[PDB]
Amino acid sequence: ARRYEHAPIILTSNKSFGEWGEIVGDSVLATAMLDRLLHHSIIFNLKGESYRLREKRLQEE
Amino acid sequence: NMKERIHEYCHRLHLPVMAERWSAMAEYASTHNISYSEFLFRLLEAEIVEKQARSIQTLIKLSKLPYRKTIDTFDFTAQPSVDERRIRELLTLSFIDRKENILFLGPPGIGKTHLAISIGMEAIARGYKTYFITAHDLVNQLRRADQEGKLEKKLRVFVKPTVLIIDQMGYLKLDPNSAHYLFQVIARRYEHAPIILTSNKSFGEWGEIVGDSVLATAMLDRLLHHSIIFNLKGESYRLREKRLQEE
Amino acid sequence: NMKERIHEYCHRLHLPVMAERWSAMAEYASTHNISYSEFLFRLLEAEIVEKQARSIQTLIKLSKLPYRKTIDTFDFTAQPSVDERRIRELLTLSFIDRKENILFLGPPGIGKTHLAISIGMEAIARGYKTYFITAHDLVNQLRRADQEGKLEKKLRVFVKPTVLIIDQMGYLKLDPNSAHYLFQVIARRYEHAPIILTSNKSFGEWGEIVGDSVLATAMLDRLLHHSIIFNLKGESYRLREKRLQEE
Amino acid sequence: NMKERIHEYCHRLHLPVMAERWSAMAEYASTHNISYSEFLFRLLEAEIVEKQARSIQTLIKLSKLPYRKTIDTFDFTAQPSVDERRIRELLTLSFIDRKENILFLGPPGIGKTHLAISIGMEAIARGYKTYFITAHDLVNQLRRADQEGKLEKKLRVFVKPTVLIIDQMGYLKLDPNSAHYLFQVIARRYEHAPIILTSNKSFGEWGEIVGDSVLATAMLDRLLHHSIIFNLKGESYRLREKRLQEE
Ligand SMILES: Nc1ncnc2c1ncn2[C@@H]1O[C@H](COP(=O)(O)OP(=O)(O)OP(=O)(O)O)[C@@H](O)[C@H]1O
Ligand SMILES: Nc1ncnc2c1ncn2[C@@H]1O[C@H](COP(=O)(O)OP(=O)(O)OP(=O)(O)O)[C@@H](O)[C@H]1O
Ligand SMILES: Nc1ncnc2c1ncn2[C@@H]1O[C@H](COP(=O)(O)OP(=O)(O)OP(=O)(O)O)[C@@H](O)[C@H]1O
Ligand SMILES: [Mg+2]
Ligand SMILES: [Mg+2]
Ligand SMILES: [Mg+2]
C-alpha cells in the first residue's frame, strides 16, 4: 500500500496469484493485495528448464 | 361402539385435543342446535388454535432464547433516544421482507437486547424461523464445527434461520481465526436473511476487535450494505433499577 | 366465509379428506336427522377410512412385494394337497405371535409363493411390517453392503421388519460367502421375528446349495427349531392353465 | 452367626455408623424397653447426623477456605459502622433467593473478609455451595484454562457453585485480558448465582484497575443490578489488636 501508485515494486514468486491466499493464510487480505498490485502491474510467466541444472549438466559433460 | 371408535379415530389423526374438544363443542351444539357447518368450524378453529400454540411453544423450545420478553414490558419514556415509530416499524417485521439488518449500538445497560429479543419472539410467533446466539458462543460453535468436520452442518443451522440474533459483539475480543469464522457466517448471510446484532463498540473499534483491519472493513461493508442501526444512549436500566430499589 | 375457512383448517391439519367428507356428511345430515354426535362419528369414520387406505398404500410402497394377491384368490379344489385348516390358521397369523417360521417346499408351479404373498398382504393390512426379497437379490444387497461399508444399515433394516419373506431359495446356488451372509441374517432373526421362505429343494440339498455342510446344518437347526413346513405337491398350475387355454 | 452378618449387612448398606449406632441404641433400649419405632428412629437420626457432619466437613475441605470463622466470633462493638441488623439479615441468606450480590468495601483491617467467610461457612452448613477464590488466582486460572483449551471446564466449575466469593479485588491491578476473563466470569453469573466480593477501592477506580473503562462499567452494572453494598469504615482491627498486645 505504501508503495502503491507511489513507487514500482519488483517481485519474484513461484506461486499463482490464487495461491497467495494460502501463502498468507488470509483469502480476503491476499485478494486485496493482488487487486491493488495488479492495478499497476506487468506480469512475466517464465517457463523453462532450470539454468542451474543445465549448468550443472554442462559441467558434468 | 361409538365413543371408543371415535377416540381411536381422533388419536389416529394425532389429535387427542380434537378428541376432547369435539366433546365440548358437540355438547354445545346439542344444547343450542348449532348447524353442522358451524359445528365443524368450531372444531377446526379450536384444534388449529391449540396446534398453533403448541407449534409456537416447540419453536421457542428449539430456539436457544436465553429468556422470554416482549416489547409490551418496555419503557419508551425513560429512554428518549428510542422513537416509538421506528420500534413499531420493526415490530411490523417489514425488515424481513426488505432484507434489512437490524443493529443496536450503545454503552451497557441501555436495553438493546430487549428490543431484539422481542422482535425475535414476534418473528417466531408469526412463523418466521429465528435463532439467538452470542458472539462468543457463535465463535465457539464455528470452531468446534470446523474441528469435528461438521462445519457444513453448523453453517447450515446458523444460516437457514430467517433471523440470526448475534449478541455480546464487542465485549469479548476476537482473534483473526474467529474473525474469519464470523466472516464466513456473514458471507453466507450476506443477502439471504436479515441479521439482528447488538454491540457496545463503534464500527471503528471492530478492526481491533477482529485483529485484522481489512477483515473488519469487509465485514462492515457486507453488513451495512443493507442495515438499519439504532444508536441508543442514556442511563443504564440496571443502574436505574438499583437506584429505585435503594429509594 | 365458513366453507373456505373450514377447508383451510382441514388442509392445515392435513385433512383434505375432512373437506370432502364434511361436504358429504353435512349434505346427508341436512337431508336427514343426524344428531351432532352421530354426524361427528360419520365424519371420523370417513377420515379414518381414507387415512387407513393411504397408510396401506404407503406401506405397500415401502414394501417390495412382487405382486398383490389375496388368499381368497387361491382355489383349494384345484390343489387338494393343501389343507384349508392350516392355511386359515396361518391367515390368523397366530404363528407370528408364537415366533414360528413358515417354509414352503415342493416342485415349482404349485403356487406356494401365492400363499406366502397373501399372508404378507394380510399382515400389512393388520399393521404388521412385512418385507419381501429374493434369495439372489438379498445376497446381492448384503454383499454390496459389506463392500460399501453399509453392512450395519442393511442388516438393521432387514432385521427390524416384523415379517421377512425370502423367495427363490434354491434356484440359484450360494457360495460360502453368501452362506455366511444368510447365516448372519438368520442368526439376527433366530428368535426375534418369523421368516416366510419358499424353496424347491429338500433340506439335504441345502448343503450343496450354500457350499458348506456345517453352515447348512446350523442354519437348518436355527430355522427349524420353531417353524412349520408345507410339503405341497401336485400339478404345475402354469402348465395346467396353458393346457386349458389350448383347449 | 448373627453379629457378623449384622456387621456385613451394615457395611453392604454402607452404614458402619448405623452399625455402631445400634450397638449403643440396642443397649439403651434393653435398659428401658424402648419401642421398635423409637429405636429405629434413634438409629436413623444418629446415622443422618453423622453423615451430614461428614458431608459438611467434605464440603469445607473441597472449598478453598483459608480458615474457618463464624460471625459469632466477631465483635460489632469495636466496629460501630456495621449494623447488627443488616449483618444478621445477610446471615439469613435471603439474598440467595433474591439473587442479590453482596459487596464489602472499606480500608484494610476492618474485617470484611471475615463476614464473607462466615457467610460461606453458613452456606456450607445449610447446603448452599460456596467457593472462595482470590482475584489474582482466579485470573491466573482463567488464563491457564484459555491456554490449555479447557476454558469451558474452568468456567463450569467456577459458575456451578451457588456462591462465589471473590477476594482481594483491588490490591492487584488487572490488564485488559484479565478484565475480559473477569467479565466472562461475571456474565456467566449475571443472574444465575449471587456473588460475594470484598474490595478496598471505589467503583470509579475499577476503570484503572481493569485497564478498560467500558468493561469496568459493564461489570459494575451487572454486579450492582441486584446487590447490597456495605461500605465499612473505621479503625483497622489488626492495628487495634497490635496496640492491645503492646499494652
Ligand atoms: N426500557 C426498558 N424497559 C424494560 N426493561 C428494560 C428496558 N431496558 C432494559 N431493560 C431490561 O434491563 C435489563 C438490562 O438490560 P439489557 O441487559 O438487555 O441491556 P444491554 O445494554 O444490552 O446490556 P449489556 O450490554 O450489559 O448486556 C434486561 O432485563 C433488560 O430486559
Ligand atoms: N390355487 C391357485 N389359483 C390360481 N392360480 C394359481 C393357484 N395356484 C397356483 N396358481 C398359479 O401359479 C402361479 C403362481 O406360482 P407361485 O410363484 O406362487 O409358485 P411357485 O411354485 O413358488 O413358483 P416358481 O415356478 O416361481 O418356483 C400363477 O400362475 C398362479 O396363477
Ligand atoms: N470484629 C472482629 N472481631 C474479631 N476479629 C476480628 C474482627 N474484625 C476483624 N477481625 C480479625 O482481624 C483480622 C483481619 O480481618 P480481615 O482480613 O477479614 O480484614 P480486611 O479488612 O478484609 O483485610 P484486608 O483488606 O487487609 O485484606 C482477621 O483475623 C479477622 O478475624
Ligand atoms: Mg446486550
Ligand atoms: Mg415361487
Ligand atoms: Mg480482605
State the Cα–Cα distance between residues C44 and C18, nearest whole angstrom: 8
Say whether D180 and B168 touch across the interface (CB within 8 A). no
Nearest bound ligand to the CA of residue C238: 2
Q: Name every chain B residue with its beta carbon within 8 A of the beta carbon of A26.
A: 176, 180, 212, 214-215
* CB distance D220 to ligand 1 below 6 Å: no
Q: How far is CA B92 from CA A35, B21, B116, in A?
A: 42, 33, 13
- Confirm or reject contact between B15 and chain C (CB < 8 A): yes
Q: Name every chain B residue with its beta carbon within 8 A of the beta carbon of D222.
A: 108, 238
Angle at B221 between CA B218 and CA B226, to 5 degrees: 145
Ligand 3 atom closest to residue D108's alpha carbon, by position in its atom list: 25
* CB distance D108 to ligand 3 below 6 Å: yes
For the beta carbon of residue B126, count every other beta carbon within 10 angstroms: 11
Question: SS3 string of chain B?
Answer: CCHHHHHHHHHHCCCHHHHHHHHHHHHHHHHHCCCHHHHHHHHHHHHHHHHHHHHHHHHHHHCCCCCCCCHHHCCCCCCCCCCHHHHHHHHCCHHHHHCCEEEEECCCCCCHHHHHHHHHHHHHHHCCCEEEEEHHHHHHHHHHHHHHCCHHHHHHHHHCCCEEEEEEECCCCCCHHHHHHHHHHHHHCCCCCCEEEEECCCHHHHHHHHCCHHHHHHHHHHHHCCEEEEECCCCCHHHHHHHHHHC
Q: How far apart are the first and last CA of chain C?
A: 67
Print burial letters for D13-49: b (CB count within 10 Å at least 16), e (below 16): eebebbbebbeebeeebeeeebeeeeeeebbeebbee
Asked if residue B178 lies in contact with residue B219, where contact means CB atoms within 8 angstroms, the answer is: no
Print burial letters for D53-91: b (CB count within 10 Å at least 16), e (below 16): eeeeeebeeebebeeebebeebeeeebeebeeeebeebe
State the Cα–Cα distance between residues A25 and C60, nearest whole angstrom: 55
Say whether B168 and D187 touch across the interface (CB within 8 A). yes
- Confirm or reject contact between B36 and chain C (CB < 8 A): yes
**Residue ID of nearest Cα to ligand 2 atom 16:** C111
Size of interface B-C (CB pairs under 8 A): 71
Structure determination technique employed: cryo-EM
Here the cell at position B226 is 443493507
* CB distance D237 to ligand 3 below 6 Å: yes
State the Cα–Cα distance between residues B159 and B188, nearest whole angstrom: 7
Q: How, if at all, do strands D130-134 and D163-169 pair? A: parallel
- Confirm or reject contact between C1 and chain B (CB < 8 A): no
State the Cα–Cα distance between residues B163 and B130, nearest whole angstrom: 4
Ligand 3 atom closest to residue D110's alpha carbon, by position in its atom list: 21
Question: Is residue D133 classed as helix, strand or coil in its secondary structure?
Answer: strand
Q: Which residue of B has its CA nearest to A32?
A: B214
- Give residue C115's identity as a one-letter amino acid code: L
Residues 6+ apart with CB under 8 A from B77: none
Q: Name every chain B residue with its beta carbon within 8 A of the beta carbon of A28.
A: 183, 214-215, 218
Question: Is residue A52 classed as helix, strand or coil in its secondary structure?
Answer: helix
Q: Best residue in B3, B7, B12, B13 to probe C by mutation, most C CBs within 10 Å?
A: B13
Q: Ligand 2 test: best mutation among C113, C136, C236, C241, most atoms within 8 Å of CB?
A: C113
**Residue ID of nearest Cα to ligand 1 atom 5:** B74
Residues 6+ apart with CB under 8 A from C154: C141, C142, C145
State the Cα–Cα distance between residues A52 and A49, nearest whole angstrom: 9
- The region that residue C74 occupies, defined by phi over 0 for left and psi between -120 and 50 for alpha, beta otherwise, is beta
Report the residue count for chain C: 247
Written as one string, the DSSP assignment of chain C is: -HHHHHHHHHHHTT-HHHHHHHHHHHHHHHTS---HHHHHHHHHHHHHHHHHHHHHHHHHHHS--S----GGGS-SSS-TTS-HHHHHHHHTTHHHHHT-EEEEESSTTS-HHHHHHHHHHHHHHHT--EEEEEHHHHHHHHHHHHHHT-HHHHHHHHHSSSEEEEEEETTS---HHHHHHHHHHHHHTSSSS-EEEEESS-GGGHHHHHT-HHHHHHHHHHHHTTEEEEE--S--HHHHHHHHHH-
Residues 6+ apart with CB under 8 A from D116: D102, D104, D132, D165, D167, D196, D198
Residues 40-59 of B with CB under 8 A from D: none
Residues 6+ apart with CB under 8 A from B210: B174, B176, B178, B179, B182, B216, B219
Please say whether the dihedral angle defined by the alpha carbons of residues D207, D213, D219 and D220, taken in this order, is positive or negative: positive
Q: Which residue of B has its CA nearest to C26?
A: B36
- Give residue B224's identity as a one-letter amino acid code: L
Print burial letters for D96-107: b (CB count within 10 Å at least 16), e (below 16): beebbbbbbbbe
* Chains interfacing with A (3 or more CB pairs < 8 Å): B
- The alpha-carbon gap from D176 to the nearest alpha carbon of chain B, in Å, equals 10
B106 marked ligand binding residue:
yes
Q: How, if at all, do strands D130-134 and C195-199 pair? A: unpaired
Find how far residue C94's CA is from the centre of its chain. Answer: 15
* CB distance D238 to ligand 3 below 6 Å: yes
Q: Which helix (H) or strand (E) holds D227?
A: strand D227-231
